[PDB]
Amino acid sequence: ATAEIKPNKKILIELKVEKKPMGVIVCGGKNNHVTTGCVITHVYPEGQVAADKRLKIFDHICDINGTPIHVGSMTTLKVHQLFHTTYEKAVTLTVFRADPPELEKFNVDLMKKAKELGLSLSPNEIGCTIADLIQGQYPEIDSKLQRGDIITKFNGDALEGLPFQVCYALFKGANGKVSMEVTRPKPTLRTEA
Amino acid sequence: AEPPLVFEPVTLESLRQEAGFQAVGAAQIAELDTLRAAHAAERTSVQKTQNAAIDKLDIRNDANIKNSINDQTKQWTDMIARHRKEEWDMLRQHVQDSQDAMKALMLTVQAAQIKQLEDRHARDIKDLNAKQAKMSADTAKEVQNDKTNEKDRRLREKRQNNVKRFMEEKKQIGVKQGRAMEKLKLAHSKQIEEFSTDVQKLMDMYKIEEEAYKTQGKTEFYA
């Protein structure tokens, strides 16, 4: 059932859920920026995924309860719904972590006005993963950022494994130019419709 | 047409865009935008106050301002829980009101496809009959060409041999048409299945989004 999940190898795990929220932010979908698979970008501590203590960030979920996770034939809402559905027992997943983990690193910039930013951030060990993005304000993020896109820098300040209070403060500062370094997963495709 | 009809599948997304659902879906969408207008004003108001107070209080980040900013990161998340509960409440309500009517539209749209195919099948039969009528004419005209009342035995025998060819063609095309009909109808049965389950998954997802948020919004702040 439960395995070791060594990187760069597909390991089939059996994770006990029992109607409990998994608490993960995933990216995937045909209408999504991540079109090459489903990848965890954030794990919440109160959820069952952190309760499993086996899934770090940038792990490609290829299968989920005997269901191959192909992002090409599913909308982003359908992939997100997989992780936000009730499950009675241990869920069977095929997970593919890598060393080095496959990822593309790009950058973003803009100027701020006062109009808030419209991003709900959840600090991670990697950065600050976007949990909710408001459309209709500051259109640049609308065409570049998404729920699941992790922010690793702000005003030149890295957000790697930082306390909650510090990230809140420096994001609250605004008042001018802005610059964020982002990381999006571009994994090797590993399924078929 | 020349190729067989290919029907677009009847999904939940396709129904929203149908003509009958419009009088209902517009009113539902209208309710959401007003309530979202109510929500949008309130976060704007809460953002003004929070962003106006945080300007007061440096890079020490060890002071007694930690309980103050997580006071903000507490009250704002409590408000957002209230917002999203109001939203999910309305969405589920919209599903209950429209639920029976949407089942009805899918049945009616699918019925339309059945009639479309039925008509297509009717034209195919008329086409076969035309081909066969010309066949009968070609056999009579050819009997007038050759010679051997003394030669009428071969034409009647050709007629006995064509009715058999005709009766078989009608038999086999009906078989093909009936399979097309059965396949189409099965498509519809699966559509009704995936419609019902997608709605069930939606509601469940709301339940689990709602539940997970209580221990998650504490780990989130708004920028």
Residue numbers in the entry:
A (entry chain B): 478 to 591, 593 to 671
B (entry chain A): 862 to 918, 926 to 1016, 1021 to 1095
From the paper:
At the inner surface of fly photoreceptor rhabdomeric membranes, the master scaffold protein INAD (encoded by inaD for inactivation no after potential D and contains 5 PDZ domains arranged in tandem) forms stoichiometric multi-molecular complexes with phospholipase Cβ (NORPA), Ca2+-permeable transient receptor potential (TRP) channel and eye-specific protein kinase C (eye-PKC). In this study, we show that the PDZ45 tandem of INAD functions as a supramodule binding to the entire C-terminal coiled-coil domain and PDZ-binding motif of NORPA (CC-PBM) with an unexpectedly high affinity.
Satisfyingly, the NORPA CC8KA-PBM–INAD PDZ45 complex could be crystallized and the structure of the complex was solved at the resolution of 3.2 Å by molecular replacement methods, using the apo-form NORPA CC-PBM structure as the search model. The most important feature of the complex is that both PDZ domains of the PDZ45 tandem and both the coiled coil and PBM of NORPA participate cooperatively to form a highly stable INAD–NORPA complex burying an extensive interaction surface area of ~1373 Å2. Structural alignment analysis showed that the INAD PDZ45 tandem, including the inter-PDZ domain interactions, underwent minimal conformational changes upon binding to NORPA CC-PBM. In site 1, NORPA PBM (‘EFYA’) inserts into the βB’/αB’ groove of PDZ5 following the typical PDZ–ligand interaction mode.
